[PDB]
Amino acid sequence: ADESLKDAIKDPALENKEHDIGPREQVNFQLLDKNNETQYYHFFSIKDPADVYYTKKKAEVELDINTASTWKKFEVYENNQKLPVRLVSYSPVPEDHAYIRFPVSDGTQELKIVSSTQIDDGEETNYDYTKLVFAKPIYNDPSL
Amino acid sequence: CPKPPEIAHGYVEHSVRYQCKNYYKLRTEGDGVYTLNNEKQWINKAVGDKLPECEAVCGKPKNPANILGGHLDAKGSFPWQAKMVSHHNLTTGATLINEQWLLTTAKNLFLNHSENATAKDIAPTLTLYVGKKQLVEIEKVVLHPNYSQVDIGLIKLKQKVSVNERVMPICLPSKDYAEVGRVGYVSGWGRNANFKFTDHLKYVMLPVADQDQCIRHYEGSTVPEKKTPKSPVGVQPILNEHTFCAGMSKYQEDTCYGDAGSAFAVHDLEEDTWYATGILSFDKSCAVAEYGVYVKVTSIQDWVQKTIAE
């Protein structure tokens, strides 16, 4: 799923599928590079605030990313270990938004994003480190 | 008659054959010849005393072929193209459907006017142009009863305009070429990529586009309950069964502000005639919005014929 995101959105089962069912929190975040200034490409590509959906086990953050067709590698790390990222809905080409979810452990605030963007067959632009900072910690609420 | 010479013991029987000058045509049943009488009357053995009249041809420009993008009008290949300017220097299109009349849009007409305004209000406001600079004056103006749905006007010229290579009406189609697979020619006085009103008439070829793809583009839908304003520029085109959409150019040329009222003109190669298949309603699309949209002329047929009668 997170090895190639623009291949991922090619699955027809995912188009305009519903991701909005259930209880959710809205948490604004910041997206910063390794000098702690905004990562402007990611800043621009991901919707702020972020829908966080409640589950039985851990809260699952949902990310809203445009130009999904030009996104390639999107890896999200919590305490430097890989989260199992998966694609839930995609919105076709005048829209070109991909919708992804991953579990986060109660208490998490910072998140690591290893990403890359490539147009068609061209130059792949690797984005080494992107720090995602929720404006407040994330806590699951199974009570809903 | 530069009088014929006499012959010994003989007389002359006069005939004339009527013929219509360049870019005109004979109308009568009415083989055209007329013989002088002993009653010194001019008489065609079919219609008798009745003369013929000369009626303008349409869809035969003297020099044919072969807006953001190209095709400078070198020759004047679009003699039916009119440039109309509203009261406040806003340039807008209209096309010449016969010797006295031009189609246009309800919208172009209503510029610098209130929804309140009626035809009588609008007609004196306009300035109209054919051919080169040719200033044709303007008698009345009449709007389609469905103006908000069918976006269409009619202009009546105070007198008939003389037809020639640069000024001449376009044919209204019997057939309807609104179908995809047809190609069309749009002339225009509208703006270009400097968003300047153009200095020279230009034209572009555009395919006609699948009606559903176009619908889904501008609204979201087909089905009316899922309709939302998806339009890439700010404003929504009028889309019904009386409209059709033309795609973008091969080279991404498209049709911008001022290009409404210009005719989507399809050349019929078998009969070598130029028909107006549509009139441009939505000239807003330009770079950003995939389809300019036209009202099928075949659908305003019985109305235009009806109006011409007055």
Partner: protein, 141 residues
């Protein structure tokens, strides 16, 4: 028409603009008043001189409008809606004028950003200001 390719380029390029987005906005306007003196007739009371605070701040507005646009580039007319009406109706700005500033914004970005101004970007950057400069104008009448 802004393909996925275009959209990517505009973001990637406008990112590399960063906090200077404000300062370019003003440099861009300045060029416009210097290059095309007719655009000054829309700004009577502004001090139009070099590095005028009034010019400099106004550029921050224009900058931000643009950033907004790339922020949601997948719907511009909703984003720019309140600006549709402002230029079209209230201010009545002649649609030719946007194409000047469009170009000044292109000259400006060129000067400050030689490495990203590859032809491919020059394309989508122009489409982007096209697409925007259209949306403000299409409510003209």
């Amino acid at each position: 028409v802004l393909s996925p390719a275009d959209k990517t380029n505009v973001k990637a390029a406008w990112g590399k603009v960063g906090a200077h987005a404000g300062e370019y906005g003003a440099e861009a306007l300045e060029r416009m008043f210097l290059s095309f003196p007719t655009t000054k007739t829309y700004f009577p009371h502004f001090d139009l001189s070099h590095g005028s605070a009034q010019v400099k701040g106004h550029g921050k507005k224009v900058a931000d409008a643009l950033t907004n646009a790339v922020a949601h580039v997948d719907d511009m007319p909703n984003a720019l809606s309140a600006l549709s009406d402002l230029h079209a109706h209230k201010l009545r700005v002649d649609p030719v004028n946007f194409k000047l500033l469009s170009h000044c914004l292109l000259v400006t970005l060129a000067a400050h950003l030689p490495a990203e101004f590859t032809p491919a970007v020059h394309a989508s950057l122009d489409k982007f200001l096209a697409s925007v400069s259209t949306v403000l104008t299409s409510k003209y009448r």
